[PDB]
Motif scaffolding. Structure first.
Motif, short mmCIF file in Angstrom:
data_model
loop_
_atom_site.label_atom_id
_atom_site.label_comp_id
_atom_site.label_asym_id
_atom_site.label_seq_id
_atom_site.Cartn_x
_atom_site.Cartn_y
_atom_site.Cartn_z
N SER B 50 36.70 -2.19 35.43
CA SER B 50 36.56 -3.36 34.57
C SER B 50 36.81 -3.04 33.10
O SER B 50 36.52 -3.87 32.24
N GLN B 65 27.71 -4.26 27.20
CA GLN B 65 28.02 -4.94 28.45
C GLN B 65 29.50 -5.25 28.50
O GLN B 65 30.16 -5.39 27.47
N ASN B 67 32.82 -7.49 30.36
CA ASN B 67 33.18 -8.79 30.91
C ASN B 67 34.65 -8.77 31.33
O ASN B 67 35.54 -9.05 30.52
N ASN B 286 32.02 -8.96 40.42
CA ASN B 286 31.40 -9.28 39.15
C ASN B 286 30.32 -10.34 39.35
O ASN B 286 30.57 -11.34 40.03
N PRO B 287 29.12 -10.16 38.80
CA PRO B 287 28.09 -11.19 38.96
C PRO B 287 28.49 -12.54 38.39
O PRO B 287 28.04 -13.58 38.90
N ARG B 288 29.31 -12.57 37.34
CA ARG B 288 29.76 -13.85 36.80
C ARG B 288 30.52 -14.67 37.83
O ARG B 288 30.41 -15.90 37.85
N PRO B 313 21.95 -14.12 39.82
CA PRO B 313 23.17 -13.56 39.20
C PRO B 313 23.01 -13.29 37.72
O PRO B 313 23.53 -12.29 37.21
N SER B 317 23.54 -9.56 36.17
CA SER B 317 24.66 -9.32 35.27
C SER B 317 24.28 -8.44 34.09
O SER B 317 25.17 -7.92 33.41
N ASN B 318 22.99 -8.26 33.81
CA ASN B 318 22.52 -7.45 32.70
C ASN B 318 21.59 -6.36 33.20
O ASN B 318 20.62 -5.98 32.53
N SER B 376 26.79 -3.73 33.70
CA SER B 376 26.99 -5.17 33.79
C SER B 376 27.95 -5.52 34.93
O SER B 376 27.56 -6.24 35.86
N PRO B 377 29.19 -5.03 34.92
CA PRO B 377 30.11 -5.36 36.01
C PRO B 377 29.77 -4.61 37.29
O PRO B 377 29.06 -3.60 37.28
N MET B 379 28.36 -4.41 41.42
CA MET B 379 27.12 -4.75 42.09
C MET B 379 26.67 -3.57 42.93
O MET B 379 27.36 -2.55 43.03
#
Ligand SMILES: [Mg+2]
Lengths: 51, 714, 50
Positions: B50, B65, B67, B286-288, B313, B317-318, B376-377, B379
Motif C-alpha cells: 500500500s 497511517q 491510505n 483495506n478496512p476502508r 472497520p 483501520s487505526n 492501518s492498511p 488486516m
C-alpha cells in the motif's frame, strides 16, 4: 525404506478383541481385516511401531 | 528394486489416491512458524503493498497511517491494495440487483441478534489480550478483569447484562481522560498497587494486537462479532459462498455449480475451470473498503445500527500491532544469554542484529509508537473472513452474461482463502478474454489471485478447500483422520466418545467396515493400557491388577463386567451406538450390578448441564450411564480481582438451596441473599416439624438468618 | 445338493457330477457316512449297482 517395507520372522502386533460377528457385513469386514492383518502382521514397520 | 510410491499415480489417478499425499495423521509435534520477526515482516510487506497511497497523521495516537484507497491504477502484476471505492460500490449494487432484498433481511436478522445478545458471550472466545494486565489471558478471566476495572472507573452499563451495554461502556471508557488500574500483591504480605493511564496510553492499548496469529482486546470483540453476524447472515443467503456450511453441504454446492456450468454449456461452447488461491488475502483487504461495503449494505437503516456496524472497520483501520516478547542475545565468549524486550527496540543500536533484521528494524522504526507498530492498511486473519467472502461472491456474481455484454461469462464459488472459477466462451480467445476481464476486475476491487498457486484446466476436475473434484467424484480431506485415542474425560466418557467418533466417521467420513473394526481394536487396547483396567484373567502386573483379579475371582458372569472392571469387549459395527452399561446390562451380576450403580457412591460428580454428557474439542455429545466410573480427574494449577473465585464461590451455595439453578438458568427479581434466607428458613421450619431437628438447631438457624438479614440491610 | 449359509444369507446348489471329489465337512454325520460308503463307486458321476 526398502528394508522397512519387507517382512520379518515373527508377528509384531497383537490387536485386541471385538464383539462376535453377526451381520453379513460384519463377516465381510472381519475377513478383510484378518487378510490385511496377516498381510502386515510381521512387516518391519510394525516392529518400528511396537518398539 | 527401489520402492517409489509416486509411480502409483501412473495407474491410480491423483484424486483417487490423494490420501497418500497427506503425511500427518494429527497435529505434527513441533508447532513452529511464528515470532516477532514474522510480525515485522508482515507489517513491512503490508505497508509495502500500500506504499503508493496517501500518508496521514492520526490526531489521537499520533501514529502515521496509510491510505491506498482510490490510489493510482496498478501497472504491474505485483500484489496491490489500491482498491477503488466506486468500483466496490458498483459491484455491491449489481450484487443487490441480482439478489434483491438480501441486504435488508440480513440487516433485520442482525438487528435481532444485536438486541438479544448478552455480555457473557465474550467468555466463549479464545485467548485474549487483556489490556489491563497487558498480557494474554483467558476470555472469561479477561472479561472479569475488564469488568472489574470498569467498575473501579465508574462504568457499570454492563451490569445490565447486555452486550450492547458493554459496548456502550467501552465507548464511555475510551473517551475518559484517565484510567485507573488497581492490582494486588498475593505474597510474605499482601499490598496494593495503583497505575494511571492517560487518554493516549489507554487508546493505544485498546487498538493493540498482541502477537503470539494475533488476538485483539475486549474492546474490539463485540463490534467484530456483530459485523460477523451480519456477514454470516448475508452469506447464508448466497449460493456461491462457501461458509458457514459443513462437510456434507460443501459437496452438494460443488456438484451443483459444476453441473450448472457444464450442462448449460452447449455443443459449441468451451468451458474451463480455474482452481485458484489468493496471493495475500488479509494483507490487501483495506478496512476502508469494508467500511464502504458496510455503508452500502446498511443503507436506509436505523442510525444506531449503522454506527454499531461501522465501528468495527473504523476501529480496525487505526489498529496497532504488538511486537511479542522481544529478542534473545547470546554471547559465546562468556556464554551469556539475555532477553531484550521489543519495547526498547525503538532505541537500541543496530549492531546486535543480522542484515535481514537490520533491514526489518530500519523499515519499521518510523511506524513504531509506544512499542507497537501502526498498521492501518491490511488486516489480520480470522476476523473478516465472511465479509471478504461476500466481496468475492459479489465480484463472481458480476460475471453474469448480462453484465459482461459479451459471449464469455463466468461463475464459481468463493471461500475467502481459495476459490474455483468456471469460464464459458465460444473460442479459446473468448476464454482468455473472460479470464483477463475477471482478473482485472478483481484487481480493481483490490483482490489478487495467486498466479502461481492457480491453474486452469477444462471443466470436470478441480479443487476447493481440500475437496478434490474429479468427474463427479469428490474426495474430502479437509480434516483427515481424527484422534482415535482416549479423549481423556473419564472412563465412561472416553469409551462413549471413542465408539461414537468411530460411528460418526463411518456414517460421514466414508470410513470402511474393516477400518472401523481395526479402529475399535486399537481404541480398546489404548483404553485398557491407559486406565490400568486390563482383563481380570490376564497378568500384566499394574497397580490396579490385584483388585481387578479379586473382583474377577469373586463374580460369576464374567461376560457382564465392564471393560474398565476387567471384562471382554463386546462392540462391533452392530452396536457402536449402544452405551456400554446398557449393552451388557442383562449379563451383569446382581451384586456387581448393585455396587457399580449405587447412586450413593462418593466417586460420581455432575456439573452444569452444558458440561454433562458433552465434551469440547467444536463440541460433541456422548451417551453414557452415570456409574461409579464417572469420576472427575484432579485439576492442575498481577491480578485485578482480589479473589479470582469470588463469582464461582457465589454461584455455588446457590445450587445448594436451589438445585434447579444447575439445570436451567434461574430467573427471579429478588436478590440472591434473600433467596437463600427464605429457602433456609422454610427448610429449617419443615425440618423441625418433621422431628429430625431439635430446638437448639432451630434457634441457631433463626438467629443466623436474622443476623444475615441485618448484615444485608445495612 | 443345496447348501445355505445363514451367516451371510446365501444359497448355492452343487451338481452330482462334482460329488465324487468334494469335502465332507459341509454335510452332517449320516450324510457324510453315506458319502463315505458310496464314494468308491461313482464313475463319471454315476454309481455302479450290479
Ligand atoms: Mg483454490
Amino acid at each position: 525404506f526398502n528394508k522397512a517395507c519387507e517382512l520379518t520372522d515373527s508377528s509384531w502386533v497383537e490387536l485386541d478383541e471385538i464383539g462376535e460377528d453377526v451381520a453379513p457385513i460384519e463377516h465381510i469386514a472381519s475377513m478383510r481385516r484378518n487378510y490385511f492383518t496377516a498381510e502386515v502382521s510381521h512387516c518391519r514397520a510394525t516392529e518400528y511401531i511396537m518398539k | 528394486m527401489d520402492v517409489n510410491p509416486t509411480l502409483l499415480f501412473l495407474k491410480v489417478p491423483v484424486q483417487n489416491a490423494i490420501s497418500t499425499t497427506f503425511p500427518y495423521t494429527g497435529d505434527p509435534p513441533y508447532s513452529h512458524g511464528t515470532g516477532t520477526g514474522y510480525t515485522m515482516d508482515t507489517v513491512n510487506r503490508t505497508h509495502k503493498y500500500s506504499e503508493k497511497g496517501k500518508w496521514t497523521t492520526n490526531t489521537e495516537t499520533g501514529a502515521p497511517q496509510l491510505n491506498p484507497i482510490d490510489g493510482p491504477l496498478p501497472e504491474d502484476n505485483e500484489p496491490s491494495g489500491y482498491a477503488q471505492t466506486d468500483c466496490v460500490l458498483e459491484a455491491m449494487a449489481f450484487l443487490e440487483e441480482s439478489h434483491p432484498g438480501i441486504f435488508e433481511n440480513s440487516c433485520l436478522e442482525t438487528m435481532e441478534i444485536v438486541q438479544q445478545t448478552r455480555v457473557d458471550k465474550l467468555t466463549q472466545g479464545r485467548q485474549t489480550y487483556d489490556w489491563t494486565l497487558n498480557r494474554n489471558q483467558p476470555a472469561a478471566t479477561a472479561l472479569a478483569n475488564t469488568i472489574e476495572v470498569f467498575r473501579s472507573n465508574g462504568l457499570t452499563a454492563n451490569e445490565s447484562g447486555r452486550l450492547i451495554d458493554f459496548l456502550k461502556d467501552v465507548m464511555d471508557s475510551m473517551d475518559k481522560e484517565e484510567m485507573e488500574i488497581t492490582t494486588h500483591f498475593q505474597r510474605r504480605t499482601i499490598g496494593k498497587k495503583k497505575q494511571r493511564l492517560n487518554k493516549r496510553s489507554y487508546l493505544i492499548r485498546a487498538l493493540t494486537l498482541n502477537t503470539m496469529i494475533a488476538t485483539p482486546g475486549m474492546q474490539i470483540r463485540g463490534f467484530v462479532y456483530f459485523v460477523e453476524a451480519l456477514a454470516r447472515s448475508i452469506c447464508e443467503k448466497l449460493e456461491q459462498s462457501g461458509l458457514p456450511v459443513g462437510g456434507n453441504e460443501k459437496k452438494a454446492k460443488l456438484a451443483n455449480v459444476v453441473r450448472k456450468m457444464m450442462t448449460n454449456s452447449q455443443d459449441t461452447e468451451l468451458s474451463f475451470t480455474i482452481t485458484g488461491d489468493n496471493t495475500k488475502w488479509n494483507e490487501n483487504q483495506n478496512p476502508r473498503m469494508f467500511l464502504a461495503m458496510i455503508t452500502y449494505i446498511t443503507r436506509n437503516q436505523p442510525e444506531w445500527f449503522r454506527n454499531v456496524l461501522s465501528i468495527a472497520p473504523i476501529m480496525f483501520s487505526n489498529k496497532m500491532a504488538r511486537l511479542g516478547k522481544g529478542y534473545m542475545f547470546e554471547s559465546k565468549s562468556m556464554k551469556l544469554r539475555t532477553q531484550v524486550p521489543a519495547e526498547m527496540l525503538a532505541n537500541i543500536d543496530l549492531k546486535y542484529f543480522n542484515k535481514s533484521t537490520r533491514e526489518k528494524i530500519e523499515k519499521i522504526r518510523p511506524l513504531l509508537i509506544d512499542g507497537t507498530a501502526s498498521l492501518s492498511p491490511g488486516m489480520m486473519m480470522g476476523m473478516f473472513n465472511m465479509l471478504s467472502t461476500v466481496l468475492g461472491v459479489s465480484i463472481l456474481n458480476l460475471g453474469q452474461k448480462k453484465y459482461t455484454k459479451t459471449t464469455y461469462w463466468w461463475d464459481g464459488l468463493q471461500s475467502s482463502d481459495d476459490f474455483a472459477l468456471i469460464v464459458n466462451a465460444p473460442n479459446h480467445e473468448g476464454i482468455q478474454a473472460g479470464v483477463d476481464r475477471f482478473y482485472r476486475t478483481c484487481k480493481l476491487v483490490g483482490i489478487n489471485m495467486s498466479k502461481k498457486k492457480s491453474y486452469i484446466n477444462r471443466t470436470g476436475t478441480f479443487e476447493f478447500t481440500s475437496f478434490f473434484y474429479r468427474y463427479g467424484f469428490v474426495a474430502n480431506f479437509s480434516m483427515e483422520l481424527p484422534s482415535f485415542g482416549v479423549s481423556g474425560i473419564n472412563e465412561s466418557a472416553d469409551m462413549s466418545v471413542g465408539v461414537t467418533v468411530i460411528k460418526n466417521n463411518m456414517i460421514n467420513n466414508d470410513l470402511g467396515p474393516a477400518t472401523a473394526q481395526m479402529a475399535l481394536q486399537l481404541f480398546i487396547k489404548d483404553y485398557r493400557y491407559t486406565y490400568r483396567c486390563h482383563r481380570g484373567d490376564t497378568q500384566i502386573q499394574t497397580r490396579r491388577a490385584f483388585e481387578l483379579g479379586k473382583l474377577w475371582e469373586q463374580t460369576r458372569s464374567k461376560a457382564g463386567l465392564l471393560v474398565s472392571d476387567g471384562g471382554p469387549n463386546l462392540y462391533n459395527i452392530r452396536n457402536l451406538h449402544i452405551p456400554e452399561v446398557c449393552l451388557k446390562w442383562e449379563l451383569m451380576d446382581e451384586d456387581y450390578q448393585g455396587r457399580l450403580c449405587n447412586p450413593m457412591n462418593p466417586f460420581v460428580s455432575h456439573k452444569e448441564i452444558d458440561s454433562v454428557n458433552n465434551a469440547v474439542v467444536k463440541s460433541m455429545e456422548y451417551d453414557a450411564v452415570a456409574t461409579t466410573h464417572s469420576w472427575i480427574p484432579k485439576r492442575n494449577r498481577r491480578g485485578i480481582l482480589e479473589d479470582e473465585q469470588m463469582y464461582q464461590k457465589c454461584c455455588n451455595l446457590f445450587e445448594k438451596f436451589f438445585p434447579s439453578s444447575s439445570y436451567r438458568r434461574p430467573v427471579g427479581i429478588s436478590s440472591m441473599v434473600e433467596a437463600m434466607v427464605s429457602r433456609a428458613r422454610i427448610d429449617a421450619r419443615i425440618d423441625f416439624e418433621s422431628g429430625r431437628i431439635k430446638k437448639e438447631e432451630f434457634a441457631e438457624i433463626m438467629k443466623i438468618c436474622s443476623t444475615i438479614e441485618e448484615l444485608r440491610r445495612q
